Design a protein around this ligand. Structure first.
Ligand code: CLA
Ligand code: CLA
Ligand code: CLA
Ligand code: CLA
Ligand code: CLA
Ligand SMILES: CCCCCCCCCCCCCCCCCC(=O)OC[C@H](CO[C@@H]1O[C@H](CO)[C@H](O)[C@H](O)[C@H]1O)OC(=O)CCCCCCCCCCCCCCCCC
Ligand SMILES: CCCCCCCCCCCCCCCCCC(=O)OC[C@H](CO[C@@H]1O[C@H](CO)[C@H](O)[C@H](O)[C@H]1O)OC(=O)CCCCCCCCCCCCCCCCC
Ligand SMILES: CCCCCCCCCCCCCCCC(=O)OC[C@H](COP(=O)(O)OC[C@@H](O)CO)OC(=O)CCCCCCCCCCCCCCC
Ligand SMILES: CCCCCCCCCCCCCCCC(=O)OC[C@H](COP(=O)(O)OC[C@@H](O)CO)OC(=O)CCCCCCCCCCCCCCC
Ligand SMILES: CCCCCCCCCCCCCCCC(=O)OC[C@H](COP(=O)(O)OC[C@@H](O)CO)OC(=O)CCCCCCCCCCCCCCC
Ligand SMILES: CCCCCCCCCCCCO[C@@H]1O[C@H](CO)[C@@H](O[C@H]2O[C@H](CO)[C@@H](O)[C@H](O)[C@H]2O)[C@H](O)[C@H]1O
Ligand SMILES: [Ca+2]
Ligand SMILES: [Fe+2]
Lengths: 176, 30, 95, 31, 39, 203, 51, 50, 243, 31, 30, 51, 50
């Protein structure tokens, strides 16, 4: 049902094209990136604080000093990526900030979509495509995908409407 | 003419990337 | 303005089966036509009138009798190149 | 392309106003 | 090579009177040239 | 209260609501007035020529606030255009004399197939995508359209291109002539101040 | 066929809702003409907010 | 002047007829006489640079 | 220059777009009767040079041809074409094209960035010679006409899903301005081209003819959207006349 | 009026760029 | 729409005049 | 009838003056077509100045 | 030639512009399409007028 809602918002609202969803996607993938990179960096900059190969027992919660080397981590990411965190508190605030801001931005977009205020179309490219049949982008292909999905899904997805679409009005490409 | 605006904003991001790498505040142990 | 096949569908091409323009799949409602007799009809197109479809060479008595039994399902219009180019009368991209 | 007539001014101002705010704040820092 | 500090660095000042004079000059230059920019 | 309609959000000030398009509120009132004049003993042209143009303008999906875009900026006149006049109510009849109604475009749909059903809900005509197996096209079904009231009052169109154009117009509700050159109108619907108010205040 | 809500008018319905329907120029949003709103026309209300 | 303008190793410079109908880039030989100080003579520009 | 080459020898080499040639000079004739028909077994056509006629902004300046480079790869040749050559009662020679791979879509790039797609074809080509011919020799020259069907078929869909027997008849992306566009109505008419096949090399022992061709035809209109440009194609041809 | 399409962006940038330069210089003064 | 630009630039000059009078650097004898 | 000086071209005459007349796209400012300028077309010169 | 006639046109003179008449010369008179040919004006008494 959630997958239906997701595909419905693609076909009827062009929700992938909405910049508020793009900020949501950036926030969620950045939060996943920050989680993975932060965990890997800490686990690979750990201090040798125990004699076992099992490094997990070289930590106690009541200790005062850091369990991993922020200096080594900073030097590594500065030489690998160009920049690096130098502030632990800023690092963790950023790990908070990125997915929460993504969720808030996607929520603003969903609020827009509630009133059918979509980023459905780029009107310049449709005006050109209506005038010029040689003009094709990936945007116009996505528009055609949305039309096909709407026409083939709406009689089953909205049965209260009694949408009778005869087979000859259904948009379809050659041979399929 | 929108192509100029797109090129400018992409160039601003890439220039910010260069100046943030090349001219960062150096991390100093103190 | 209508395109060409929309102008055809305004004519008798939209009511029944045109011996010059209609695809082979339109002959399936006529018993004993698809695929052989319909292929011969499409191969020997165009026809000025409906009756010269009974003048196709290679017609046995069964094919002649089945064409006479269903002569009232056919019309002839002008052969339109929009439905004929690239063998669309055999395969128009419809399955 | 038939774009919004205000798209260029909106894009330049949307970029340039907070850019100016950030540059003002950075350059005065340490005063 | 080492990155040494430059001793020729000198602060830039613009006082409030200079700010007001420059802002007025820029405003009146905009007032003067906007009609020609629009044409 | 902006979105659902209120005494404090009247439709003359902020536009009609999307729910008035959804349930056919203005269309139902227009049909009630026409049926009242038909019961009084008037002709179809007489019954349809006393529908006010304002009431017909409410019964138009381009005035619904749920047809806009987030970056389709500005006035609704930048979209379809400035409304000049009501073209009158179409009645579509097929070649066998059945009265056909174009299924209207819901608020959800950016595009909608053109479908004509009779009184008992059976599709009798359409504008087919594929014409190779078309059965209910306007060309085969012989759909003509007669306009009552408005600019096109007393007129009948039987050329299938005109009938298909008027079918696509009737999909949007009551058809109107638009001036599209004053604001260089691009043809995509905008939302009303009702929709923009609701969006800003919800966000 | 060209009321305020077709023209993008945002604050004009809010002036009209509470009682300010006429202009100094001579037009009203109800379509009536020749009315005298006094000072409290649309322009007078706008001027009062600026002041 | 001696390689690029003369076309010895280079394209030369743009010359035309007096009415600008047949303009093209050609190697230009230096003019060492007083007509090298004719401002409409390209061979003057070539000699100048040499 | 293949003869005994296996498909494994030819694959990915570009020689499959090359028509076969005569083995040597072997400059002979094929003796023909007064009034019979012969079969052309595997007629081939390798286009080599491509020209598009310029449409200047003037309406009196001479139009001229400009060479084009081929944006498509070595997919530009017609081959395995069956046809017939009929000798006339006066003596004229009538080459008739029956079937085969007798069309290739070809896009040529012009200077200035204009890509010109066109339907290079020999479809239903009927060509005749001068009267008084008794042998297919180096003076044999079939000049005639061929059909150029529309480059896009009438089931083609434009990027807004408008076509001729399929697709929308209007610009559905702009619902209040859906019928304001002339590109809403598509059309696939039949154009005409002129082809001259000049036979320059004949082989008498095998019935092999070869030579050069010049063809002139329209370009793609994209279902009637734009005016067709004139495309001149020069190349060489080969065939086997069955005696 | 049929004005230059770049007149608005030229007027806003002609005003706003040296305004920004002056504000940057004034606010950092005393550092 | 040029009227907006003219009003803005005139308003910027008049605002500069107000802030230069009301919020000048005070002249101090020292 | 539409040469560079009707089109506002400022730097293109200066490239053309010293020997760069052709483009990579295939056109030349003398009206000739089909020439091969090598790298030193207008686009190549512009790219060399950017680099 | 049409080029020679196009040179003989005051809209191609550089002393006809304006300081704030911005851009290309094609933004002014337009893009030149074709020469209309040389006019000869004659009055009713057969004198040639320039
Ligand atoms: C919420 C208050 C509000 C509302 C509902 C409206 C509504 C309306 N205005 Mg209006 N206006 C407002 C405030 C408002 N305005 C303000 C404050 C100003 C002064 C700047 C104006 C100046 C103005 C003018 C000059 C015009 C309008 C017009 C209009 C109408 C057309 C709508 C449109 O095109 O906008 C489009 C809306 C958008 C494209 C959405 C913008 C959303 C932004 C870009 C999102 C930003 C994302 C953010 C930066 C990311 C966050 C980052 C994260 C990390 C935190 C409409 C009825 C037009 C009209 O029709 O006049 C009669 C007209 O020309 N308004
Ligand atoms: C006496 C001064 C005065 C007067 C007569 C007006 C009159 C007007 N204003 Mg203005 N305004 C004023 C001062 C004034 N204003 C001031 C000081 C500001 C700056 C804040 C504004 C900012 C302003 C804006 C932005 C707008 C107006 C607008 C308007 C017009 C319509 C107002 C409307 O929709 O009502 C709406 C008012 C409310 C719905 C009141 C909300 C109060 C809430 C419900 C109470 C909150 C709860 C409470 C605190 C606790 C419960 C109390 C209970 C127990 C008793 C109207 C002509 C509109 C207009 O048409 O533009 C020209 C408009 O857009 N005004
Ligand atoms: C035999 C070899 C040879 C040849 C054929 C030439 C040929 C030429 N030389 Mg060269 N020259 C040579 C050797 C040669 N030279 C040598 C050995 C030197 C010493 C290094 C020079 C130094 C030289 C200079 C400095 C100049 C030339 C110039 C010229 C060109 C003159 C045409 C012209 O446009 O005048 C135009 C230039 C002038 C008439 C001189 C300007 C005089 C003004 C009036 C003085 C300006 C003062 C003030 C700032 C402005 C007042 C105006 C007021 C209203 C504001 C011509 C092609 C000129 C040039 O560059 O052409 C574009 C030029 O300026 N030559
Ligand atoms: C080897 C490097 C190189 C090469 C081959 C080019 C080539 C070119 N440039 Mg580029 N350029 C370069 C480096 C280069 N440039 C650099 C480093 C810069 C930054 C300063 C530029 C900035 C630049 C600009 C702004 C422009 C070009 C342009 C051009 C094109 C035409 C040049 C022209 O008109 O000549 C003109 C050159 C002169 C008239 C030389 C002036 C020298 C004076 C006369 C000498 C001064 C007196 C001397 C010091 C003392 C006397 C000496 C005597 C005694 C011997 C041409 C394709 C133009 C173009 O077409 O844009 C794409 C153009 O607008 N270039
Ligand atoms: C001197 C060098 C120079 C020259 C001769 C040209 C010449 C030309 N350019 Mg060009 N350009 C240049 C530099 C130059 N440009 C630079 C540096 C840039 C980067 C910004 C550009 C970017 C550019 C673009 C994008 C375009 C051109 C175009 C053109 C052509 C049209 C002219 C026009 O409309 O401008 C109009 C000129 C004016 C309106 C005069 C402006 C003078 C200012 C406003 C005076 C300022 C007064 C000052 C502030 C007061 C002082 C205060 C006091 C107290 C001190 C023309 C042949 C156009 C073209 O045709 O392209 C093919 C085109 O679209 N140029
Ligand atoms: C310095 C200080 C000033 C700084 C300004 C910084 C500017 C930044 C760039 C502007 C960004 C917005 C540009 C919009 C695009 C545009 O050009 O529109 C252009 C539109 C104008 O629209 C025009 O209208 C005309 C009729 O008047 C015609 O119809 C034109 O066709 C039409 O283009 O501008 C506006 O309408 C402004 C109002 C926008 C806000 C209304 C909705 C309010 C709700 C906002 C919700 C926000 C949520 C964010 C959440 C997080
Ligand atoms: C941040 C950094 C960048 C800051 C930018 C600050 C911008 C300020 C505003 C710009 C001021 C100039 C605007 C010109 C008006 C305009 O819009 O033109 C608009 C023009 C564009 O012109 C356009 O051209 C098109 C074809 O390409 C079409 O023909 C259009 O019709 C035409 O409008 O812009 C330019 O041409 C820029 C070049 C201007 C300079 C050329 C002459 C050089 C000589 C200058 C002498 C100066 C002397 C000063 C002495 C003291
Ligand atoms: C035996 C399972 C191994 C499968 C590999 C997956 C675990 C490793 C993934 C970490 C990637 C990030 C790399 C940096 C992270 C990094 O550097 O890690 C550091 C961390 C510290 O380990 P130590 O060095 O103390 O010990 C590991 C070795 O050095 C010697 O034991 O390594 C581990 O914990 C390995 C334990 C894996 C064994 C159990 C894990 C089981 C998880 C998978 C179960 C199935 C999941 C799907 C089911 C739906
Ligand atoms: C191999 C050579 C280099 C590889 C190429 C990598 C280029 C990009 C490197 C990132 C540039 C840094 C700019 C961030 C500004 C910067 O330099 O901040 C440096 C910052 C260091 O923070 P501190 O810990 O020093 O903060 C302490 C206090 O100053 C807090 O304000 O690092 C981060 O914040 C990481 C979190 C954001 C990471 C943002 C990176 C996003 C990835 C790139 C996005 C590209 C968008 C444009 C595409 C057109
Ligand atoms: C490509 C991007 C290019 C970026 C361009 C950046 C533009 C930079 C513009 C610089 C601002 C210039 C103004 C500085 C203003 C300023 O700094 O204050 C006045 C300044 C006094 O400086 P002092 O020598 O006292 O130095 C003390 C410091 O605090 C100032 O730096 O003297 C001048 O600068 C002389 C030039 C302006 C003289 C006054 C002109 C305005 C008076 C009249 C106002 C108009 C009335 C008109 C009525 C008809
Ligand atoms: C700095 C590194 C090198 C940069 C890349 C190399 C230079 C390439 C870009 C040069 C700048 C623009 O260069 C030129 O752009 C125009 C404008 O679209 C293209 O032009 C193309 O598109 C236009 C319209 O869109 C049409 O006329 C036509 O379809 C085609 O010519 C040219 O093919 C290209 O030569
Ligand atoms: Ca069929
Ligand atoms: Fe952590």
């Amino acid at each position: 049902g959630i997958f239906r809602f997701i595909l419905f918002l693609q076909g009827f609202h062009n929700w992938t094209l909405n910049p508020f969803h793009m900020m949501g996607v950036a926030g969620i993938l950045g939060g996943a990136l920050l989680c993975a990179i932060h965990g890997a960096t800490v686990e690979n900059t750990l201090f040798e604080d125990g004699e076992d190969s099992n490094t997990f027992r070289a930590f106690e919660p009541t200790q005062a000093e850091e369990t991993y080397s922020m200096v080594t981590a900073n030097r590594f990411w500065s030489q690998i990526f160009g920049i690096a965190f130098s502030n632990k508190r800023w690092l963790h605030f950023f790990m908070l900030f990125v997915p929460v801001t993504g969720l808030w931005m996607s929520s603003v977009g969903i609020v827009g979509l509630a009133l059918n205020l979509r980023a459905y179309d780029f009107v310049s490219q449709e005006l050109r495509a209506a005038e010029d049949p040689e003009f094709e982008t990936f945007y116009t292909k996505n528009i055609l995908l949305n039309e096909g999905m709407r026409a083939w899904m709406a009689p089953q997805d909205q049965p209260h409407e009694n949408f009778i679409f005869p087979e000859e009005v259904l948009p379809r490409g050659n041979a399929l | 003419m929108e192509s100029v605006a797109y090129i400018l904003v992409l160039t601003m991001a890439l220039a910010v990337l260069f100046f943030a790498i090349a001219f960062r505040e150096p991390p100093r142990i103190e | 303005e209508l395109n060409a096949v929309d102008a055809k569908l305004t004519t008798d091409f939209g009511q029944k089966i045109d011996l010059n323009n209609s695809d082979i799949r339109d002959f399936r409602g006529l018993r004993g036509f698809y695929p052989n007799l319909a292929s011969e009809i499409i191969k020997n197109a165009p026809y000025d009138t409906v009756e010269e479809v009974l003048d196709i060479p290679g017609l046995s008595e069964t094919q002649k009798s089945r064409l006479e039994a269903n002569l009232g399902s056919f019309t002839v219009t002008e052969p339109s190149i929009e439905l004929t180019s690239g063998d669309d009368r055999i395969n128009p991209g419809v399955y | 392309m038939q774009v919004n007539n205000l798209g260029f001014i909106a894009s330049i101002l949307f970029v340039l106003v907070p850019t100016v705010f950030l540059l003002i704040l950075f350059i005065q820092t340490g005063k | 090579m080492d990155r040494n500090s430059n001793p020729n660095r000198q602060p830039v000042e613009l006082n409030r009177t200079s700010l007001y004079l420059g802002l007025l000059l820029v405003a009146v230059l905009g007032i003067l040239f906007s009609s020609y920019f629009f044409n | 209260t902006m979105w659902y309609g209120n005494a404090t959000t009247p439709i003359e000030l902020f536009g009609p609501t999307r729910y008035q398009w959804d349930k056919g509120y203005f269309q139902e009132e227009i049909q009630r007035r026409v049926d009242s004049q038909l019961a009084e003993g008037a002709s179809l042209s007489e019954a349809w020529s006393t529908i006010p143009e304002k009431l017909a303008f409410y019964d138009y999906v381009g005035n619904s606030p749920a047809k806009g875009g987030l970056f389709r900026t500005g006035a609704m006149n930048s979209g379809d255009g400035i409304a000049q006049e009501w073209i009158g109510h179409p009645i579509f009849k097929d070649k066998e004399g059945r009265e056909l109604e174009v299924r209207r475009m819901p608020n959800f749909f950016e595009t909608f197939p053109v479908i004509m059903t009779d009184a008992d809900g059976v599709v009798r005509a359409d504008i087919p995508f594929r014409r190779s197996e078309s059965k209910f096209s306007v060309e085969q079904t012989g759909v003509t359209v007669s306009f009552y009231g408005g600019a096109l009052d007393g007129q009948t169109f039987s050329n299938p291109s005109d009938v298909k154009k008027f079918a696509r117009k009737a999909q949007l509700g009551e058809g109107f002539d638009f001036d599209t050159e004053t604001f260089n109108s691009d043809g995509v619907f905008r939302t009303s101040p009702r929709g923009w108010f609701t969006f800003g205040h919800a966000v | 066929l060209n009321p305020m809500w077709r023209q993008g008018m945002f604050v004009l319905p809010f002036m009209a809702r509470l009682g300010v329907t006429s202009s100094w120029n001579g037009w009203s949003v109800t379509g009536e003409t020749g009315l005298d709103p006094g000072f409290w026309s649309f322009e007078g209300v706008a001027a009062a907010h600026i002041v | 002047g001696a390689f690029h303008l003369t076309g010895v190793w280079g394209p030369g410079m743009w010359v035309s007829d007096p009415y600008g109908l047949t303009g093209h880039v050609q190697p230009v030989a230096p003019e060492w006489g007083p007509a090298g100080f004719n401002p409409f003579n390209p061979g003057g520009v070539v000699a100048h640079h040499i | 220059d293949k003869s005994q080459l296996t498909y494994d020898d030819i694959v990915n080499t570009g020689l499959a777009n090359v028509c076969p040639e005569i083995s040597s000079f072997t400059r002979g004739t094929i003796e023909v009767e007064p009034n019979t028909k012969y079969f052309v077994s595997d007629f081939c056509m390798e286009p080599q040079e491509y020209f598009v006629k310029e449409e200047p902004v003037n309406k009196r300046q001479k139009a001229e041809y400009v060479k084009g480079k081929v944006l498509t790869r070595q997919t530009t040749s017609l081959e395995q074409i069956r046809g017939s050559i009929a000798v006339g009662a006066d003596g004229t020679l009538t080459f008739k094209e029956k079937d085969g791979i007798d069309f290739q879509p070809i896009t040529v790039l012009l200077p200035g960035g204009e890509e010109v797609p066109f339907f290079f074809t020999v479809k239903n080509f009927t060509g005749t010679t001068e009267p008084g011919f008794t042998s297919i020799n180096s003076s044999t020259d079939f000049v005639g006409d061929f059909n150029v069907p529309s480059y896009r078929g009438a089931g083609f869909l434009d990027p807004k899903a408008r076509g001729l027997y399929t697709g929308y008849d209007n610009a559905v992306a702009l619902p209040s301005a859906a019928d304001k566009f002339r590109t809403n109505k598509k059309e696939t008419p039949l154009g005409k081209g002129t082809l001259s096949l000049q036979v320059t090399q004949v082989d008498g022992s095998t019935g092999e003819i070869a030579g050069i061709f010049e063809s002139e035809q329209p370009s793609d209109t994209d279902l009637g959207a734009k005016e067709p440009l004139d495309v001149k194609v020069r190349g060489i041809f080969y065939g086997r006349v069955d005696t």
